[PDB]
Amino acid sequence: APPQPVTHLIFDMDGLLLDTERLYSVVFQEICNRYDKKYSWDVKSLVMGKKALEAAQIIIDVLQLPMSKEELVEESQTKLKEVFPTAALMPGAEKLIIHLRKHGIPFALATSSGSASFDMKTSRHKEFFSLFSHIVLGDDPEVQHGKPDPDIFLACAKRFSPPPAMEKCLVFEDAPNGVEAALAAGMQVVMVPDGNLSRDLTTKATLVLNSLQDFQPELFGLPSYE
């Protein structure tokens, strides 16, 4: 469907604004390989956008790992805490966010990451995340399930004042679960997937781009870059 104008933007964090998915990947690969299993792209495609416990359970079930979701979360989080602060902004992220800010376009963050993980990941980036109108995290009491459940995006949209119609919201996502959550919420979505994701999982979004650098805001009725 052709892109329609929007007034409010909602961003994913992991893999979209920050390069944190590579950190998850290295840690889960190390754990999976102990058990002679490969933490592969098909598995990643299932768990990106999920809350930590949800993701862990899926990894365990799909790869048949001999652990509980609680054990996998505890171990992986212990390892990830050491490296989360090294997260870096993705290409085009700063340019876009600063542009939206200048033009007073409301935008917010909607991430399945919990509080502690968010705090660690954003250690070097507090000035960037301070530009968001508001932030909804995965441990928000209003949000029961991770993506592809639409609740995190619905909750995020409802916290703008005044709240927009969902159809005037534009989501930015790197993950197929996030694309599905946006569509289920009645929102348009720009996907910026890793090119290793399958064709089937990267042909559902309103627009699919190789980089945020390629996003043309005017396509959605927003101001062009200066």
Closest to Mg ion by CB, 138 vs 217, is: 138
146 binds Mg ion (CB under 5 A): no
Check binding of 12 to Mg ion (CB under 5 A): yes
What is the nearest approach in angstroms of Mg ion to the Cβ of residue 16? 5
12 is in an annotated binding site: yes
Q: Is 14 in the site for Mg ion (CB under 5 A)?
A: yes
CA distance 1 to 154: 21
d(CA 113, CA 145): 12
15 is an interface residue for Mg ion by CB under 5 A: yes
Per the structure block, which two tokens stand in for 96? 């876009």
Is 200 assigned a ligand-binding role in the annotation? Answer: no
Q: What phi and psi values does residue 108 have, to the nearest 5 degrees?
A: -145, 170
Is residue 175 near Mg ion by the rule CB under 5 A?
Answer: yes
Q: How many residues bind to Mg ion according to rule CB under 5 A?
A: 6
CB 107 within 8 A of CB 11: yes
The least CB distance from residue 191 to Mg ion, in Å, is 10
- Cβ of residue 34: shortest distance to Mg ion, in angstroms? 26
Part of the chain binding Mg ion (CB under 5 A), chosen from 7-15, 77-85, 91-99, 218-226:
7-15
Using rule CB under 5 A, residue 193 touches Mg ion: no
Using the rule CB under 5 A, is 180 a contact of Mg ion?
no
User: Could you confirm whether 140 is annotated as catalytic?
Assistant: no
* Closest residue to Mg ion in the complex (CB): 15
Q: Is 14 among the catalytic positions?
A: yes
Least distance from Mg ion to the Cβ atom of residue 54, Å: 14
Residue 188's φ and ψ, nearest 5 degrees, are: -75, 160
Sheet of 135-136, strand order: 135-136, 107-110, 8-11, 169-173, 188-191, 207-208
Active-site residues: which are they?
A: 12, 14
Residues at the binding site for Mg(2+) are 12, 14
Q: Which residues bind Mg ion (CB under 5 A)?
A: 12, 14-16, 174-175
